[PDB]
Amino acid sequence: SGEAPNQALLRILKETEFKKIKVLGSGAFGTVYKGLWIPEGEKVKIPVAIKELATSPKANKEILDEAYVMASVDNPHVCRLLGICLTSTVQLITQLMPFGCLLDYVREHKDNIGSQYLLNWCVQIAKGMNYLEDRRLVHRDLAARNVLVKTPQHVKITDFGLAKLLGAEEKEYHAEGGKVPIKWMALESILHRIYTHQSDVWSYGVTVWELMTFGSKPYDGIPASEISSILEKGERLPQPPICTIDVYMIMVKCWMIDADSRPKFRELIIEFSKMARDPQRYLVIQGDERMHLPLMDEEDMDDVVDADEYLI
Ligand SMILES: COc1cc(N2CCC(N3CCN(C)CC3)CC2)ccc1Nc1ncc(Cl)c(Nc2ccccc2P(C)(C)=O)n1
DSSP, rough: SOOOOOOOOOOOOOGGGGGEEEEEEEESEEEEEEEEEOOTTTTTOOEEEEEEEOOOHHHHHHHHHHHHHHHOOOOTBBBOOOEEESSSSSEEEEEOOOOOBBBHHHTTTTTTTOHHOOOOOOHHHHHHHHHHHHEEOSSSSOOOGEEEEETTTEEEEEOOOOEEEEOOOOOEEEEOOOOEEEEEEHHHHHHHHHOOOOHHHHHHHHHHHHHHHHHTTTTOOOOOOHHHHHHHTOOOOOTTTTOOOOHHHHHHHHHHHHHHGGGOOOHHHHHHHHHHTTTEEEBBOTTTTTTTOOOOOSOOSSSSOOTTTTOO
């Protein structure tokens, strides 16, 4: 056995077991609805998100590839599949993240978000991404829009549409034609269509930047065709006003031209955990102590990290 068998269970749900309530979104992805799921016999009601896309055989092929990935994942900072409903068009059933996506959250709560929240989101996105590195998955679409908010204290990574499982020997995913978001893409991915976990580290840099700028558009007012050139010259995204050189040097390292020089997601967990232990030393936000949402024993404990944050 070259690779290990995937013994994950695919749960199939009855259309009668769940009730749609509202539409949450529409667009390229298709449409996402909010619902309740009463599993038959169990005196339990589960708040769910039902995702779909008229029927097309080319469309159902892609939604079932996504369900494959989502049913294989199991981490507190990764969105998992609750089940699939086999109707006219295939429906994806996942957990409802009541606070919506993280991009719209940072925009809405711009003046109530404190350093402690921002740095913790950074630790959590890294933990979820380190899980994907462990499972040999290359997300290929990490952005603040693809991070959902369960509570302001707990975030999870979503959208496994472009995700690719790498073989125990395979170390790069050579893509072909297809619409990829350029502003979040690593330089190697724009020039050679190569995707590694290190190319995901790049996209993590831009996500951290989106959070720190309270939801700004990377390279705002710059056409897609230019981004390849701008990055080749040595230009990167600017230093966000709330950022200390310490946080910005982490971002800048995620954008190294040499992929192997960029930090590993487990190094990003360690680095953002230390910063989350004194958040005011790393993010300068006016009114940090009033901003709300719904300590040692020995020598210098600056480099102190809890075992839960020290992965390998
Ligand atoms: C209560 O549930 C939600 C509400 C909102 N929004 C709806 C617009 C609302 N707006 C904000 C702007 N404001 C001016 C006016 C009110 C803010 C809250 C967003 C998301 C979820 N939950 C949720 N669970 C699971 C999924 Cl999986 C999902 N995903 C999802 C939901 C919608 C579209 C796309 C996705 P994706 C990224 C493509 O999976 N989304």
